[PDB]
């Protein structure tokens, strides 16, 4: 299993080396999004949490299609603010409850080392 801690100061850097195979080895959920919010990667651990099938959600839009409950000022609001600014590093608790048993999580968003892309990292609390 891939050894990286939730909330690590250098997390973008560690994750930079990792293929979709390596993503799946993480102890927490990981989602890679473009600036429009389309899903570029989605790991196994995120799948275990939400019920979604990772391969199948690649290419969809997180905020419109997959996770409309995060389409709010306190999640999406912050995302787009980070994209506009070109910098994003924030951690909050939230409840996932779209077509599922409601599930409180800790969510951590950060800009990746790449270009124009962003991480969402997720663990149960």
From Swiss-Prot:
Entry keyword Repressor: no
Q: Which residues are modified to S-(4-hydroxycinnamyl)cysteine?
A: 69
The alphabetized UniProt keywords are: Chromophore, Photoreceptor protein, Receptor, Sensory transduction
Q: How is it modified after translation?
A: The 4-hydroxycinnamic acid (p-coumaric acid) chromophore is covalently bound via a thioester linkage.
Query: Which is one GO molecular function term here?
Result: photoreceptor activity
**Is this entry keyworded Membrane?**
no
- Domain PAS, by residue range, is 23-86
Any one Gene Ontology BP term:
phototransduction
Say what the protein does. Answer: Photoactive blue light protein. Probably functions as a photoreceptor for a negative phototaxis response.
Family the UniProt entry places it in: Belongs to the photoactive yellow protein family.
- Assembly information from the UniProt record: Monomer.
Q: Name the chain's protein.
A: Photoactive yellow protein
| The gene coding this protein | pyp
């Amino acid at each position: 299993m891939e050894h990286v801690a939730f909330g690590s100061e250098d997390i973008e850097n560690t994750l930079a080396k990792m293929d979709d195979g390596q993503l799946d080895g993480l102890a927490f959920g990981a989602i890679q999004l473009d600036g429009d919010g389309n899903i570029l990667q989605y790991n196994a651990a995120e799948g275990d949490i939400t019920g979604r099938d990772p391969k199948q959600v690649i290419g969809k839009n997180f905020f419109k299609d997959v996770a409309p409950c995060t389409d709010s000022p306190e999640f999406y609001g912050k995302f787009k603010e980070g994209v506009a600014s070109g910098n994003l590093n924030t951690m909050f608790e939230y409840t996932f409850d779209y077509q599922m048993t409601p599930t409180k999580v800790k969510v951590h968003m950060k800009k990746a080392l790449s270009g124009d892309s962003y991480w969402v990292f997720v663990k149960r609390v």
